[PDB]
Design a protein around this ligand. Structure first.
Ligand SMILES: CC(=O)N[C@H]1[C@@H](OP(=O)(O)OP(=O)(O)OC[C@H]2O[C@@H](n3ccc(=O)[nH]c3=O)[C@H](O)[C@@H]2O)O[C@H](CO)[C@@H](OP(=O)(O)O)[C@@H]1O[C@H](C)C(=O)O
Lengths: 394, 52
Protein backbone atom coordinates (compact mmCIF):
# COMPACT_ATOMS: atom_id res chain seq x y z
CA UNK A 1 0.00 0.00 0.00
CA UNK A 2 1.74 3.15 -1.27
CA UNK A 3 0.94 6.71 -0.12
CA UNK A 4 -1.86 8.49 -2.00
CA UNK A 5 0.36 11.51 -2.82
CA UNK A 6 3.83 13.04 -2.33
CA UNK A 7 4.64 14.61 1.05
CA UNK A 8 5.41 18.33 0.58
CA UNK A 9 8.68 19.55 2.10
CA UNK A 10 8.74 22.72 4.16
CA UNK A 11 11.78 25.02 4.21
CA UNK A 12 13.16 25.06 7.79
CA UNK A 13 16.25 27.06 6.75
CA UNK A 14 19.18 26.91 9.19
CA UNK A 15 17.18 24.81 11.70
CA UNK A 16 19.14 21.58 11.12
CA UNK A 17 17.09 19.68 13.77
CA UNK A 18 13.61 20.10 12.23
CA UNK A 19 15.09 19.54 8.77
CA UNK A 20 16.27 16.07 9.94
CA UNK A 21 12.99 15.28 11.77
CA UNK A 22 11.15 16.05 8.51
CA UNK A 23 13.29 13.63 6.51
CA UNK A 24 13.00 10.84 9.13
CA UNK A 25 9.22 11.43 9.19
CA UNK A 26 8.89 11.27 5.37
CA UNK A 27 11.09 8.15 5.25
CA UNK A 28 9.01 6.41 7.95
CA UNK A 29 5.63 7.30 6.38
CA UNK A 30 6.74 6.29 2.86
CA UNK A 31 8.51 3.01 3.71
CA UNK A 32 6.30 1.65 6.55
CA UNK A 33 2.90 2.65 5.28
CA UNK A 34 1.40 -0.81 5.59
CA UNK A 35 2.42 -1.31 9.17
CA UNK A 36 1.55 2.26 10.17
CA UNK A 37 -2.01 2.05 8.80
CA UNK A 38 -2.47 -1.38 10.42
CA UNK A 39 -1.55 0.06 13.84
CA UNK A 40 -3.78 3.11 13.20
CA UNK A 41 -6.82 0.93 12.49
CA UNK A 42 -6.52 -2.06 14.78
CA UNK A 43 -4.96 -0.46 17.89
CA UNK A 44 -5.47 3.34 18.30
CA UNK A 45 -8.78 4.93 19.49
CA UNK A 46 -10.06 5.36 15.89
CA UNK A 47 -13.27 3.26 15.50
CA UNK A 48 -11.20 0.59 13.69
CA UNK A 49 -9.64 3.24 11.42
CA UNK A 50 -12.98 4.87 10.46
CA UNK A 51 -12.16 8.04 12.38
CA UNK A 52 -9.48 9.49 10.08
CA UNK A 53 -7.37 12.40 11.29
CA UNK A 54 -3.82 13.72 10.76
CA UNK A 55 -3.50 14.59 14.49
CA UNK A 56 -4.10 10.98 15.61
CA UNK A 57 -1.51 9.80 13.03
CA UNK A 58 1.18 12.02 14.66
CA UNK A 59 1.11 9.70 17.72
CA UNK A 60 2.59 6.88 15.57
CA UNK A 61 5.78 8.91 14.80
CA UNK A 62 8.76 8.46 17.19
CA UNK A 63 9.50 12.22 17.39
CA UNK A 64 5.99 12.78 18.86
CA UNK A 65 6.35 10.34 21.84
CA UNK A 66 7.62 12.79 24.47
CA UNK A 67 5.15 15.48 25.59
CA UNK A 68 7.98 18.11 25.59
CA UNK A 69 8.81 17.64 21.89
CA UNK A 70 5.29 17.79 20.37
CA UNK A 71 4.96 21.57 19.83
CA UNK A 72 8.46 21.76 18.28
CA UNK A 73 8.28 18.74 15.91
CA UNK A 74 4.62 19.21 14.78
CA UNK A 75 5.27 21.25 11.61
CA UNK A 76 8.11 18.87 10.61
CA UNK A 77 5.94 15.70 10.85
CA UNK A 78 2.49 17.15 9.92
CA UNK A 79 2.51 16.64 6.13
CA UNK A 80 3.59 12.99 6.54
CA UNK A 81 0.74 12.53 9.06
CA UNK A 82 -1.72 14.32 6.72
CA UNK A 83 -0.77 12.20 3.67
CA UNK A 84 -1.07 9.04 5.80
CA UNK A 85 -4.58 10.24 6.77
CA UNK A 86 -5.36 10.77 3.07
CA UNK A 87 -4.03 7.27 2.32
CA UNK A 88 -6.17 5.87 5.18
CA UNK A 89 -9.26 7.76 3.90
CA UNK A 90 -8.79 6.01 0.52
CA UNK A 91 -8.25 2.54 2.07
CA UNK A 92 -11.49 2.80 4.06
CA UNK A 93 -13.38 3.71 0.84
CA UNK A 94 -11.92 0.60 -0.90
CA UNK A 95 -13.61 -1.74 1.66
CA UNK A 96 -16.67 -3.28 -0.04
CA UNK A 97 -19.35 -2.44 2.55
CA UNK A 98 -22.85 -1.92 1.01
CA UNK A 99 -24.41 -1.24 4.46
CA UNK A 100 -22.05 1.72 5.07
CA UNK A 101 -23.39 4.72 3.07
CA UNK A 102 -22.41 7.88 5.02
CA UNK A 103 -19.19 9.96 5.08
CA UNK A 104 -18.88 12.80 7.62
CA UNK A 105 -16.36 15.68 7.48
CA UNK A 106 -15.71 17.62 10.72
CA UNK A 107 -13.96 21.00 10.35
CA UNK A 108 -13.34 24.23 12.23
CA UNK A 109 -10.88 26.44 14.11
CA UNK A 110 -8.36 24.67 16.43
CA UNK A 111 -9.64 24.43 20.02
CA UNK A 112 -13.38 24.58 19.14
CA UNK A 113 -14.08 21.06 20.52
CA UNK A 114 -14.16 19.10 17.27
CA UNK A 115 -12.52 15.96 18.66
CA UNK A 116 -14.62 16.12 21.86
CA UNK A 117 -17.72 16.45 19.61
CA UNK A 118 -16.57 13.41 17.54
CA UNK A 119 -16.17 11.35 20.75
CA UNK A 120 -19.75 12.36 21.67
CA UNK A 121 -21.01 10.99 18.33
CA UNK A 122 -22.13 7.35 18.45
CA UNK A 123 -21.19 5.28 15.40
CA UNK A 124 -24.05 3.86 13.35
CA UNK A 125 -24.46 0.92 10.97
CA UNK A 126 -24.60 3.34 8.00
CA UNK A 127 -21.46 5.34 9.00
CA UNK A 128 -18.57 4.50 6.64
CA UNK A 129 -15.94 7.08 7.47
CA UNK A 130 -15.44 10.19 9.60
CA UNK A 131 -12.70 12.65 8.52
CA UNK A 132 -11.46 15.53 10.71
CA UNK A 133 -9.60 18.24 8.77
CA UNK A 134 -9.48 21.82 7.44
CA UNK A 135 -11.71 22.82 4.52
CA UNK A 136 -10.67 26.52 4.45
CA UNK A 137 -8.29 25.72 1.57
CA UNK A 138 -10.65 23.06 0.15
CA UNK A 139 -8.66 21.92 -2.93
CA UNK A 140 -7.59 18.64 -1.29
CA UNK A 141 -11.12 18.01 0.06
CA UNK A 142 -12.46 18.19 -3.53
CA UNK A 143 -10.58 14.97 -4.36
CA UNK A 144 -12.01 13.37 -1.17
CA UNK A 145 -15.63 14.48 -1.78
CA UNK A 146 -15.26 13.47 -5.46
CA UNK A 147 -14.41 9.86 -4.50
CA UNK A 148 -17.38 9.68 -2.09
CA UNK A 149 -19.79 10.76 -4.85
CA UNK A 150 -18.27 8.18 -7.28
CA UNK A 151 -19.39 5.44 -4.85
CA UNK A 152 -22.88 6.95 -4.22
CA UNK A 153 -22.05 7.81 -0.58
CA UNK A 154 -23.88 10.53 1.38
CA UNK A 155 -21.46 13.34 2.27
CA UNK A 156 -22.12 15.62 5.25
CA UNK A 157 -19.87 18.51 6.40
CA UNK A 158 -20.04 19.74 10.03
CA UNK A 159 -18.47 23.18 10.58
CA UNK A 160 -17.76 23.61 14.32
CA UNK A 161 -17.37 27.28 15.35
CA UNK A 162 -16.22 29.35 18.32
CA UNK A 163 -14.74 32.79 19.10
CA UNK A 164 -10.98 32.96 18.44
CA UNK A 165 -10.35 33.99 22.07
CA UNK A 166 -12.32 31.17 23.76
CA UNK A 167 -10.82 28.74 21.22
CA UNK A 168 -7.32 30.03 22.08
CA UNK A 169 -7.99 29.36 25.80
CA UNK A 170 -8.84 25.71 24.97
CA UNK A 171 -5.56 25.27 23.03
CA UNK A 172 -3.56 26.59 26.04
CA UNK A 173 -5.03 23.86 28.30
CA UNK A 174 -4.39 21.28 25.57
CA UNK A 175 -0.74 22.42 25.27
CA UNK A 176 -0.11 22.15 29.03
CA UNK A 177 -1.57 18.60 29.26
CA UNK A 178 -1.15 17.03 25.76
CA UNK A 179 1.90 19.03 24.63
CA UNK A 180 0.38 20.38 21.39
CA UNK A 181 -1.69 23.55 21.10
CA UNK A 182 -2.03 25.59 17.91
CA UNK A 183 -0.41 28.63 16.28
CA UNK A 184 -2.37 31.88 15.98
CA UNK A 185 -1.31 32.05 12.30
CA UNK A 186 -3.16 28.83 11.43
CA UNK A 187 -6.13 29.60 13.78
CA UNK A 188 -6.72 32.95 12.05
CA UNK A 189 -6.15 31.47 8.57
CA UNK A 190 -8.69 28.67 9.13
CA UNK A 191 -11.38 30.84 10.77
CA UNK A 192 -11.16 33.73 8.28
CA UNK A 193 -11.14 31.52 5.17
CA UNK A 194 -13.52 28.71 6.28
CA UNK A 195 -16.63 30.49 4.90
CA UNK A 196 -14.93 30.88 1.50
CA UNK A 197 -13.96 27.19 1.42
CA UNK A 198 -17.45 25.93 2.30
CA UNK A 199 -19.03 28.29 -0.24
CA UNK A 200 -16.44 27.11 -2.73
CA UNK A 201 -17.39 23.51 -1.97
CA UNK A 202 -21.09 24.35 -2.23
CA UNK A 203 -20.86 25.89 -5.70
CA UNK A 204 -18.89 22.89 -6.96
CA UNK A 205 -21.10 20.06 -5.63
CA UNK A 206 -24.45 21.62 -4.62
CA UNK A 207 -27.13 19.51 -2.91
CA UNK A 208 -24.94 16.37 -3.22
CA UNK A 209 -22.97 17.68 -0.23
CA UNK A 210 -24.91 18.70 2.88
CA UNK A 211 -23.33 21.50 4.96
CA UNK A 212 -24.34 22.07 8.61
CA UNK A 213 -22.83 23.90 11.59
CA UNK A 214 -22.32 23.78 15.37
CA UNK A 215 -22.17 27.11 17.24
CA UNK A 216 -20.18 26.40 20.43
CA UNK A 217 -20.76 29.98 21.69
CA UNK A 218 -24.53 29.22 21.93
CA UNK A 219 -24.31 25.90 23.88
CA UNK A 220 -23.43 23.70 20.86
CA UNK A 221 -26.41 24.94 18.78
CA UNK A 222 -27.01 22.87 15.60
CA UNK A 223 -27.36 24.99 12.42
CA UNK A 224 -29.19 23.19 9.58
CA UNK A 225 -29.29 25.70 6.71
CA UNK A 226 -26.20 26.78 4.72
CA UNK A 227 -26.96 30.53 4.84
CA UNK A 228 -27.09 30.35 8.67
CA UNK A 229 -23.75 28.43 8.72
CA UNK A 230 -22.05 31.27 6.77
CA UNK A 231 -23.39 33.92 9.24
CA UNK A 232 -22.12 31.92 12.25
CA UNK A 233 -18.66 31.48 10.68
CA UNK A 234 -18.31 35.12 9.48
CA UNK A 235 -16.27 36.29 12.49
CA UNK A 236 -13.96 38.82 10.75
CA UNK A 237 -11.04 38.95 8.32
CA UNK A 238 -7.69 37.19 8.65
CA UNK A 239 -5.98 40.52 9.47
CA UNK A 240 -8.49 41.24 12.27
CA UNK A 241 -8.44 37.79 13.90
CA UNK A 242 -4.64 37.51 13.70
CA UNK A 243 -4.47 41.05 15.14
CA UNK A 244 -6.74 40.23 18.08
CA UNK A 245 -4.95 36.90 18.68
CA UNK A 246 -1.48 38.55 18.57
CA UNK A 247 -2.57 41.07 21.24
CA UNK A 248 -4.23 38.33 23.32
CA UNK A 249 -1.26 35.91 23.46
CA UNK A 250 1.08 38.84 24.22
CA UNK A 251 -1.20 40.27 26.96
CA UNK A 252 -1.60 36.79 28.48
CA UNK A 253 2.19 36.32 28.56
CA UNK A 254 2.91 39.82 29.98
CA UNK A 255 0.36 39.28 32.81
CA UNK A 256 1.77 35.82 33.74
CA UNK A 257 -1.34 33.83 32.71
CA UNK A 258 0.61 31.53 30.31
CA UNK A 259 4.23 30.30 30.31
CA UNK A 260 6.95 31.23 27.78
CA UNK A 261 6.66 27.79 26.09
CA UNK A 262 2.87 28.15 25.72
CA UNK A 263 3.42 31.69 24.38
CA UNK A 264 5.99 30.48 21.82
CA UNK A 265 3.92 27.60 20.42
CA UNK A 266 0.96 30.00 20.06
CA UNK A 267 3.23 32.59 18.43
CA UNK A 268 4.72 30.02 16.05
CA UNK A 269 6.51 31.54 13.05
CA UNK A 270 4.73 34.95 13.37
CA UNK A 271 6.67 38.18 13.62
CA UNK A 272 4.32 39.87 16.13
CA UNK A 273 5.94 43.32 15.68
CA UNK A 274 4.76 43.25 12.04
CA UNK A 275 1.17 42.40 13.14
CA UNK A 276 1.08 45.13 15.82
CA UNK A 277 2.31 47.76 13.31
CA UNK A 278 -0.71 47.04 11.03
CA UNK A 279 -3.15 47.99 13.82
CA UNK A 280 -5.12 51.23 13.22
CA UNK A 281 -6.14 53.86 15.79
CA UNK A 282 -8.00 55.94 13.21
CA UNK A 283 -11.14 56.73 15.21
CA UNK A 284 -9.37 56.86 18.60
CA UNK A 285 -7.99 59.35 21.10
CA UNK A 286 -6.64 59.59 24.65
CA UNK A 287 -7.81 62.29 27.08
CA UNK A 288 -5.34 63.04 29.92
CA UNK A 289 -5.73 64.84 33.26
CA UNK A 290 -4.62 64.91 36.94
CA UNK A 291 -6.72 61.77 37.66
CA UNK A 292 -5.36 59.69 34.72
CA UNK A 293 -5.82 58.75 31.03
CA UNK A 294 -8.99 57.67 29.22
CA UNK A 295 -9.17 55.81 25.90
CA UNK A 296 -12.15 56.83 23.73
CA UNK A 297 -13.44 55.69 20.30
CA UNK A 298 -15.61 57.81 17.97
CA UNK A 299 -18.56 56.13 16.19
CA UNK A 300 -20.29 57.02 12.86
CA UNK A 301 -22.65 59.38 14.77
CA UNK A 302 -19.55 61.42 15.93
CA UNK A 303 -19.95 60.63 19.64
CA UNK A 304 -16.92 59.77 21.74
CA UNK A 305 -17.44 57.04 24.37
CA UNK A 306 -15.07 55.69 27.04
CA UNK A 307 -13.35 52.35 26.34
CA UNK A 308 -10.87 52.23 29.24
CA UNK A 309 -9.62 54.40 32.15
CA UNK A 310 -6.17 54.09 33.78
CA UNK A 311 -5.45 56.07 36.99
CA UNK A 312 -2.10 57.92 36.87
CA UNK A 313 -0.78 60.89 38.89
CA UNK A 314 1.21 63.94 37.70
CA UNK A 315 -0.21 64.43 34.19
CA UNK A 316 -1.51 67.72 32.80
CA UNK A 317 -4.68 68.10 30.70
CA UNK A 318 -4.55 67.05 27.06
CA UNK A 319 -6.29 65.47 24.07
CA UNK A 320 -4.25 63.23 21.74
CA UNK A 321 -5.49 61.76 18.44
CA UNK A 322 -3.81 58.33 18.20
CA UNK A 323 -4.58 58.00 14.47
CA UNK A 324 -2.41 61.05 13.68
CA UNK A 325 0.72 59.83 15.52
CA UNK A 326 4.04 59.79 13.62
CA UNK A 327 5.67 56.36 13.32
CA UNK A 328 9.10 56.26 14.98
CA UNK A 329 11.95 55.96 12.47
CA UNK A 330 14.52 53.35 13.54
CA UNK A 331 17.94 54.54 14.81
CA UNK A 332 16.63 57.79 16.35
CA UNK A 333 15.99 58.92 19.93
CA UNK A 334 12.51 60.26 20.81
CA UNK A 335 12.24 62.08 24.18
CA UNK A 336 9.01 62.79 26.11
CA UNK A 337 6.10 61.62 28.28
CA UNK A 338 4.30 58.32 27.57
CA UNK A 339 0.57 59.18 27.32
CA UNK A 340 -0.81 55.74 26.38
CA UNK A 341 0.31 52.13 26.15
CA UNK A 342 -1.39 48.85 25.12
CA UNK A 343 -0.41 45.38 23.81
CA UNK A 344 0.46 46.68 20.29
CA UNK A 345 1.76 50.27 20.66
CA UNK A 346 3.42 52.88 22.89
CA UNK A 347 2.38 56.54 22.38
CA UNK A 348 4.86 59.27 23.34
CA UNK A 349 4.39 63.06 23.19
CA UNK A 350 7.60 64.66 21.87
CA UNK A 351 8.27 68.33 21.06
CA UNK A 352 7.53 67.41 17.39
CA UNK A 353 4.07 66.00 18.24
CA UNK A 354 2.70 62.56 19.14
CA UNK A 355 4.92 59.57 18.24
CA UNK A 356 4.03 55.86 17.97
CA UNK A 357 6.41 52.99 18.84
CA UNK A 358 5.63 49.32 18.30
CA UNK A 359 5.31 47.57 21.67
CA UNK A 360 7.82 44.95 20.41
CA UNK A 361 11.15 45.75 18.68
CA UNK A 362 13.03 42.72 17.23
CA UNK A 363 11.55 40.34 19.86
CA UNK A 364 12.40 42.74 22.75
CA UNK A 365 9.40 44.05 24.62
CA UNK A 366 9.28 47.90 24.72
CA UNK A 367 5.94 48.19 26.59
CA UNK A 368 7.20 46.73 29.90
CA UNK A 369 10.19 49.16 29.98
CA UNK A 370 7.96 52.30 30.27
CA UNK A 371 5.01 53.51 32.37
CA UNK A 372 2.18 55.84 31.36
CA UNK A 373 2.97 59.32 32.71
CA UNK A 374 6.72 58.55 32.83
CA UNK A 375 9.14 60.81 30.93
CA UNK A 376 11.61 58.75 28.86
CA UNK A 377 13.86 58.69 25.83
CA UNK A 378 13.41 55.73 23.43
CA UNK A 379 16.13 54.93 20.86
CA UNK A 380 17.55 51.84 19.14
CA UNK A 381 21.31 51.28 18.76
CA UNK A 382 21.84 48.50 16.15
CA UNK A 383 18.67 46.48 16.84
CA UNK A 384 19.04 46.80 20.65
CA UNK A 385 16.64 49.03 22.61
CA UNK A 386 17.90 51.99 24.68
CA UNK A 387 15.29 53.30 27.17
CA UNK A 388 16.50 56.03 29.58
CA UNK A 389 14.43 57.82 32.22
CA UNK A 390 14.34 61.63 32.07
CA UNK A 391 12.46 62.15 35.37
CA UNK A 392 13.80 64.88 37.67
CA UNK A 393 13.02 67.31 40.49
CA UNK A 394 14.26 70.95 40.45
CA UNK B 1 -33.40 13.60 7.89
CA UNK B 2 -30.38 11.30 7.42
CA UNK B 3 -28.74 9.19 10.14
CA UNK B 4 -25.66 11.45 10.02
CA UNK B 5 -27.68 14.61 10.78
CA UNK B 6 -29.34 12.83 13.73
CA UNK B 7 -25.90 11.63 14.94
CA UNK B 8 -24.64 15.25 14.93
CA UNK B 9 -27.67 16.55 16.90
CA UNK B 10 -27.24 13.84 19.56
CA UNK B 11 -23.56 14.83 19.77
CA UNK B 12 -24.63 18.48 20.34
CA UNK B 13 -26.68 17.33 23.38
CA UNK B 14 -23.69 15.64 25.00
CA UNK B 15 -21.73 18.87 24.35
CA UNK B 16 -24.38 20.64 26.49
CA UNK B 17 -24.17 17.84 29.10
CA UNK B 18 -20.38 18.54 29.39
CA UNK B 19 -21.13 22.10 30.61
CA UNK B 20 -23.31 21.02 33.58
CA UNK B 21 -21.96 17.53 34.40
CA UNK B 22 -18.28 17.89 35.45
CA UNK B 23 -17.66 14.16 36.02
CA UNK B 24 -18.80 13.52 32.41
CA UNK B 25 -16.48 16.23 30.99
CA UNK B 26 -13.37 14.87 32.77
CA UNK B 27 -13.93 11.30 31.50
CA UNK B 28 -14.25 12.50 27.87
CA UNK B 29 -11.18 14.80 27.95
CA UNK B 30 -9.07 12.14 29.77
CA UNK B 31 -9.15 9.74 26.78
CA UNK B 32 -8.75 12.27 23.95
CA UNK B 33 -5.37 13.81 24.78
CA UNK B 34 -3.60 10.99 26.67
CA UNK B 35 -1.39 9.64 23.87
CA UNK B 36 -0.83 6.08 22.61
CA UNK B 37 -1.78 3.23 24.99
CA UNK B 38 0.86 0.90 26.60
CA UNK B 39 -0.21 -1.93 24.21
CA UNK B 40 0.13 0.24 21.08
CA UNK B 41 3.37 1.83 22.37
CA UNK B 42 4.94 -1.66 22.67
CA UNK B 43 4.11 -2.37 18.99
CA UNK B 44 5.34 1.08 17.89
CA UNK B 45 8.73 0.69 19.62
CA UNK B 46 9.38 -2.55 17.69
CA UNK B 47 8.28 -0.88 14.42
CA UNK B 48 10.53 2.16 15.00
CA UNK B 49 13.52 0.08 16.23
CA UNK B 50 13.31 -2.41 13.35
CA UNK B 51 13.64 0.40 10.74
CA UNK B 52 16.44 2.91 11.47
C1 LIG C 1 -3.91 23.29 7.93
C2 LIG C 1 -2.91 22.41 8.63
O1 LIG C 1 -1.77 22.27 8.19
N1 LIG C 1 -3.32 21.78 9.75
C3 LIG C 1 -4.65 21.71 10.32
C4 LIG C 1 -5.61 20.81 9.53
O2 LIG C 1 -4.99 19.56 9.32
P1 LIG C 1 -5.06 18.88 7.92
O3 LIG C 1 -4.52 17.44 8.07
O4 LIG C 1 -6.46 18.90 7.36
O5 LIG C 1 -4.10 19.69 7.02
P2 LIG C 1 -3.55 19.62 5.58
O6 LIG C 1 -2.05 19.69 5.61
O7 LIG C 1 -4.16 20.84 4.84
O8 LIG C 1 -4.02 18.28 4.90
C5 LIG C 1 -5.24 18.19 4.14
C6 LIG C 1 -5.04 17.23 2.99
O9 LIG C 1 -4.08 17.77 2.07
C7 LIG C 1 -3.41 16.72 1.41
N2 LIG C 1 -1.94 16.91 1.60
C8 LIG C 1 -1.45 17.48 2.75
C9 LIG C 1 -0.11 17.66 2.97
C10 LIG C 1 0.83 17.24 1.98
O10 LIG C 1 2.07 17.35 2.05
N3 LIG C 1 0.26 16.66 0.85
C11 LIG C 1 -1.08 16.47 0.60
O11 LIG C 1 -1.48 15.94 -0.43
C12 LIG C 1 -3.96 15.41 1.99
O12 LIG C 1 -4.94 14.84 1.15
C13 LIG C 1 -4.50 15.86 3.35
O13 LIG C 1 -5.54 15.02 3.81
O14 LIG C 1 -6.86 20.64 10.17
C14 LIG C 1 -6.77 20.08 11.49
C15 LIG C 1 -8.20 19.89 11.96
O15 LIG C 1 -8.88 21.14 11.99
C16 LIG C 1 -5.95 21.00 12.39
O16 LIG C 1 -5.82 20.38 13.67
P3 LIG C 1 -6.65 20.81 14.99
O17 LIG C 1 -7.69 21.82 14.58
O18 LIG C 1 -7.25 19.50 15.43
O19 LIG C 1 -5.59 21.33 15.92
C17 LIG C 1 -4.58 21.27 11.79
O20 LIG C 1 -3.95 22.34 12.51
C18 LIG C 1 -3.16 21.97 13.65
C19 LIG C 1 -3.12 23.18 14.57
C20 LIG C 1 -1.73 21.56 13.29
O21 LIG C 1 -1.47 21.57 12.01
O22 LIG C 1 -0.94 21.24 14.15
Amino acid sequence: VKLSSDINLRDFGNNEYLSSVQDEAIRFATEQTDEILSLYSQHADTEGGRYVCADTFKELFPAFENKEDRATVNNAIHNSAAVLSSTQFDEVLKRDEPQKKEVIFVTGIPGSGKTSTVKNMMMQDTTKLLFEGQLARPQSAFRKIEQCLERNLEVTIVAVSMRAERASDNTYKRFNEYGRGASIGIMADIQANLPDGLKQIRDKFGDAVKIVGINQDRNSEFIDKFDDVIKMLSLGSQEQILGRLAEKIQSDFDSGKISRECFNQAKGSMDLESVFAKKEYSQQRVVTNSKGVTLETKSANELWSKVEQIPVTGMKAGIYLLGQAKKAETGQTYSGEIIYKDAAAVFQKTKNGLVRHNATHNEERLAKLVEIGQNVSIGSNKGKLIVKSLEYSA
Amino acid sequence: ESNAIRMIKEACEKNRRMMTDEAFRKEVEKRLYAGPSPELLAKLRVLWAANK
